[PDB]
Amino acid sequence: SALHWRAAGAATVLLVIVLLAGSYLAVLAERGAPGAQLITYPRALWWSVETATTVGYGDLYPVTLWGRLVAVVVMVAGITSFGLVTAALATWFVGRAQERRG
């Protein structure tokens, strides 16, 4: 199909990969740091989602350098993915409006 849809699909799949890789890598980075809570995989996956969506409740977060770098990648991938879907939606509406005119 068209580019904007392919990119949206690709961005979504990629986002899911980053959430999975990020959850695993966050636990690896945080264990060994006294006080870290982002240390078991199930809640790390939850953490990765609320990070990618930019909600950031504060129930979980990284305290180490690498856990934070992993977090930054998760944030940017999430913002970029949703931004790209918005961009695809705009392309869709714009194309249609041209049609409604000619």
Partner: antibody, heavy 118, light 108 residues
Framework: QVQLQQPGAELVKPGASVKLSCKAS????????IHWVKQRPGHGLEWIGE????????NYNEKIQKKATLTADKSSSTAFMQLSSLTSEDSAVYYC???????????WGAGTTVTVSS | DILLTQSPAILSVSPGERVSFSCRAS??????IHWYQQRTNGSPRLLIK???ESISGIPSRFSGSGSGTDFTLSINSVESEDIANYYC?????????FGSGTKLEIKR
């Protein structure tokens, strides 16, 4: 079948070192962590450290004099704990346990009785 | 690091009576507490995970409760095989820590 295999015992002369093993069978995931716990006679369970075989990173109890060094051999599904320069304080049963990255020790090894004596 | 307190260290109960072991965390750990049983010369055995979740193979008699800083492991109608040491363990913060243990004694 026995998920975690540990030798029954190890005799070590004071000052020397010994390498304990923990052979795992059963389901194995890249996300499994192998933990080591020390228990002196008549006392409780003391957490020593952990290692993730798929990556090889290890963490240790910082609160106690560091006597251990953890390694893992992926091909033989065996985890190792190197204890060096031991004293009578190091004599105890050392258990290895498997954690699926979800916080609890689902299964434990039989433990290796380590004795420091001349 | 989280200090897990188990008091009393020894509990004497009569047969068939309900018993409760206490485990207190130095700070709130949600429900990230797990219980293990260790009989004489035996290895530890998982009884309850995340405060109250059942483990297959463990008798219905065992149950757990609590959240925050205070947790309880209970046994409905104690019998001889329950004589052992009981430990709590937390996985809320790194590093994982163990309670000091409680011994179960039966007065026959």
């Amino acid at each position: 079948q026995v998920q975690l295999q540990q030798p029954g015992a190890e005799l070590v002369k004071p000052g020397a070192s010994v390498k304990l093993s923990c052979k795992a069978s059963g389901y194995t995931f890249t996300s499994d962590w192998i933990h080591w716990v020390k228990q002196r006679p008549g006392h409780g369970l003391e957490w020593i450290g952990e290692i993730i075989p798929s990556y090889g990173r290890a963490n240790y109890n910082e609160k106690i004099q560091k006597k251990a060094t953890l390694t893992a051999d992926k091909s033989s599904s065996t985890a190792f704990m190197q204890l060096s320069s031991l004293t009578s304080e190091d004599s105890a049963v050392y258990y290895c346990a498997r954690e699926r990255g979800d916080g609890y020790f689902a299964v434990w090894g039989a433990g290796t009785t380590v004795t420091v004596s001349s | 690091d989280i200090l897990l307190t188990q008091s009393p260290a020894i509990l004497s109960v009569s047969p068939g009576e309900r018993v409760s072991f206490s485990c207190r965390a130095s700070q709130s750990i949600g429900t990230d507490i797990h219980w293990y049983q260790q009989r004489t010369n035996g290895s530890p055995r998982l009884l309850i995970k995340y405060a109250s979740e059942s483990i297959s193979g463990i008798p219905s008699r065992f149950s757990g409760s609590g959240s925050g800083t205070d947790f309880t492991l209970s046994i409905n109608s104690v019998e001889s095989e329950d004589i052992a040491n009981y430990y709590c363990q937390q996985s809320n913060r790194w590093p994982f820590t163990f309670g000091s243990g409680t011994k179960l004694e039966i007065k026959r």
